[PDB]
Design a protein around this ligand. Structure first.
Ligand SMILES: O=C(O)COc1ccc(Cl)cc1Cl
Ligand SMILES: O=C(O)COc1ccc(Cl)cc1Cl
Ligand SMILES: O=C(O)CCC(=O)C(=O)O
Ligand SMILES: O=C(O)CCC(=O)C(=O)O
Ligand SMILES: O=C(O)CCC(=O)C(=O)O
Ligand SMILES: O=C(O)CCC(=O)C(=O)O
Ligand SMILES: [Co+2]
Ligand SMILES: [Co+2]
Lengths: 285, 286, 285, 285
């Protein structure tokens, strides 16, 4: 099918390695257009073997949308737009992204994508998981969809940098996390439980254990029952895929219909990636 | 309280009331029966102590709310097919009858609207019967949640009392009050809403039970399980319940649409005997 | 059976009415031995129609053990040993005894029994619930018992007057609750999961949602799964009974093997009972 | 580390690719000692690019142990020791291995390993999951371990070809499933919950929702809760890995310390593998 790029899917649910196009070089319109169609079709896409410069890097995210850095992550020197996912060899500190989630939904308008580029990865370990919230919502019964179709959910960063994160035990290392503000993190914002992708118009579920605190207008007692069920349902194995990282590998994931998570199976070893973050609109029903 | 011909004393702040000042051997005058009924629709369960009536007065009294309609699995006595047993020998390992919360025979397409029981031989202490109001079950939910589930229907079926899941269990029921009901009558499915309105009251309730409710219509076994388990957790709080204590010839009527009930099994070794008719009801609607 | 007192049990599981004894005038010893003997068999005991004085009251509790008032609750004018469980006819704030519990299990040595006296109670409503943790534990499979037999549980008063309590909604209105110390509130203390009664030597389960924070030495995830089960199992309806309050009814419950809770089925009304507390030694397996 | 074989691990938890040895030609002892030693460290091992015969296949497993075909699976013409994993492109009815499990544990001694060969697999789709029940066990608290250490569990083929399968909603397809004996299926068996692997002497948790009915000695309520916790815990994402199948790739997995499952994302596509099953001893604590 695809003509200007060679597209090799990873599973029957999400993901594809794309090859036969050099991201060091400016992309013509028919090449990049297919790149987009894949991303909107395969949700995560990665390009192995791309020795790009941080400038070519920022340039590529710019095609999807404006660079909108995430609050939390420290920038690389010189490029405020380029942020680290760096973890030193001396470990024992919370891993970033230890659980399934989408990135920073506590914003009123959270990112639409983010592109990661592997600098130094360990020979084995420190994979990254990805799962499809198209598949999450689509495997529900209509009766269930029609029941939960209308509900909205209250997100908040209190857990990752708010009140509850201040009254707990350990922290993140300061190698990729900025000192945050206790109240700006603890800030609420409301998103639907079921979002419509702006481009695909296909419907996905929208919730995660990192930021979703409760359903708007529900007693905690219900909200927990119901969100605990979705987390159970949406994080089945049959929905995921698993990216393995090799130097100069570059990846783009859709931050609205895919959740991701980092696997902490590399203690003792060094692991460094970089990532720009592309902006999005208020998530819409 | 505000009552003419009857002395009516509640049991809790939620449901239940004692009725006194009337002989149920004595066909009630009309000014009396109207005041009795107003309670039975506000206190949901009501009981009369001591009334040493008969199976001819007994059947007469159920007949006033509605027709005598025996329930399938139970047995009626020598001479009276209309009066059905709640009998347990002082030695029965056999399963207890009604030992989880339920409304009676909701797998019927139009399940009963009330039922009247009479203490024949009850122990002094032991064998109480519990009740909770599913109005208050539903009322204590957030509007948002009511808003979410008001439209769902639930598929009831007796496949647990006399269908496949009961035909392949362990201990069976006590064959004292259980008749040979069969496999196909049990496994038979039937659908009533999740949320019901009382015909007489215009109040909204809730309608589900761990004995007969199988799944939410149109939901995956895994969805239906989470949501129904949540609702039971919630409708069987202690705050919604009350507990009746039985003294021989205590005669009692419960509403089998806005209340659940269950038989507390604290008496094995004892003999415990009640009789019960079963006034018939309508199909229950949203 | 009982010769000096009239004993009419309430259920087959636990609970009993005692009659045929005048609690205003000192009890002869054979009468008090049968009183206690019932208290130890039936766990909860009530004496209806006992028009007693605050002095006969304290003297009656001192036959169970030295009177040590509980923190939190207010003492009556003139008697420090008598405590209020008073509620005005304005139902602004949260109820006392709202969920199943035993009294102050966060103490290192919590109360052994406590005696309540109905001052003025509503016509219908304002019940108190009771359940037997002998019955909880004896209904576990022998196999199950040996699994948990050895476990310990970390109790704490936070949620009632610690850091987690001063954080969320309502307070208790101070018509019977005193201002507490958060450092004693967050204070932790460790008891068995299965306690052997001092006097009867029968074993009871020992855990409650008000005070139990976690199983000693378990992961938050493990401990949560496990306490959830026991609370589900131990608060079945079949194990409970329901005492209905009438003026001058005097009640004694074993605060070691019975859990209790108070019903808010009396909103709008006025309900006032008073209560002394008999002390016990640290619970032992 | 490794000298006669090239061992490239797959995650930091379990899994390894083996290269630098031709499995068509007999193993010398120095080479085989390393192969086995790899199998025992990494639990799942696979070799890419091995165009072997049903005979070299069978020859290779006997090096692990005697081959005793698994009940259920249809064998290929000419080699009853070789069993099919075939699914035609006309595929709806239940997939084989749809959930996490160890293979046929209702036996009194379930296989210790099994070796699989990709005959013709789809370009993408139908990957196979693997998770380490060492890690299941290893991540429990010491306290928790001592609690569940002692228990035994009743496994049964009721669910796959026993009593309840003969009266459910849907069925299997006979391209690789045989007509099974109904009571032979309903036949029970008891294994420890925590097994000590013969060779490695490491301990693993041993339970799976496909075959485990209940814990010996517990009430349906107890047994139901406890395994639901253990299934939740042992099937975290962080414990798994994912093998992607490519033609003539040969895989060996340890059937006592790993569970596996088949991913049903190849609908419409054609997938065929072959597998011998190596025998084991009664599983021991
Ligand atoms: O950077 C982001 O958008 C948020 O990432 C996270 C997700 C889960 C957890 Cl537990 C912690 C972190 Cl920092
Ligand atoms: O005596 C104690 O410290 C324990 O008493 C209580 C426990 C729980 C609640 Cl909700 C209210 C009260 Cl008074
Ligand atoms: O370390 C990784 O795999 C990515 C960290 C992550 O998930 C994130 O960027 O939010
Ligand atoms: O209380 C009882 O024992 C009987 C109640 C019951 O289960 C029924 O009549 O169906
Ligand atoms: O208010 C009641 O009836 C009892 C409440 C309670 O649990 C207590 O005072 O310890
Ligand atoms: O196709 C697969 O992944 C294997 C099927 C399976 O589960 C088994 O071998 O038992
Ligand atoms: Co009933
Ligand atoms: Co298998």
């Amino acid at each position: 099918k695809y003509r200007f790029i060679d597209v090799q899917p990873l599973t029957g649910v999400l993901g594809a390695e794309i090859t036969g196009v050099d991201l060091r070089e400016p992309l013509d319109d028919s090449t990049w257009n297919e790149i987009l169609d894949a991303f909107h079709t395969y949700q995560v896409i990665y390009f192995p073997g791309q020795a790009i410069t941080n400038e070519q890097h920022i340039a590529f995210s710019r095609r999807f949308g404006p660079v909108d850095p995430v609050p939390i992550l420290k920038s690389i020197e010189g490029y405020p737009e380029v942020q680290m996912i760096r973890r030193e060899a001396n470990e024992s500190s919370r891993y970033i992204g230890d659980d399934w989630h989408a990135d920073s939904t506590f914003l009123d308008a959270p990112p639409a994508a983010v592109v990661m580029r592997a600098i130094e990865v360990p020979e084995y370990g420190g994979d990254t998981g990805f799962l499809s919230m198209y598949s999450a919502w689509e495997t529900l019964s209509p009766t269930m969809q029609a029941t939960i179709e209308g509900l909205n959910v209250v997100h908040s960063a209190t857990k990752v940098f708010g009140s509850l994160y201040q009254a707990t035990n350990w922290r993140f290392s300061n190698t990729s996390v900025k000192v945050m503000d206790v109240d700006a993190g603890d800030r609420e914002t409301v998103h639907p439980l079921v979002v419509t992708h702006p481009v695909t118009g296909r419907r996905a579920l929208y919730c995660n254990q990192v930021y979703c605190q409760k359903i708007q207008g529900m007693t905690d007692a219900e909200s927990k029952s119901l969100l605990q069920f979705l987390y159970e349902h949406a994080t089945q194995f049959d929905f995921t895929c698993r990216v393995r990282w090799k130097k100069d590998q570059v990846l783009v994931w859709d931050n609205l219909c895919t959740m991701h998570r980092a696997v902490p199976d590399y203690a003792g070893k060094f692991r460094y990636l970089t990532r720009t973050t592309v902006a999005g609109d208020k998530p819409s029903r």
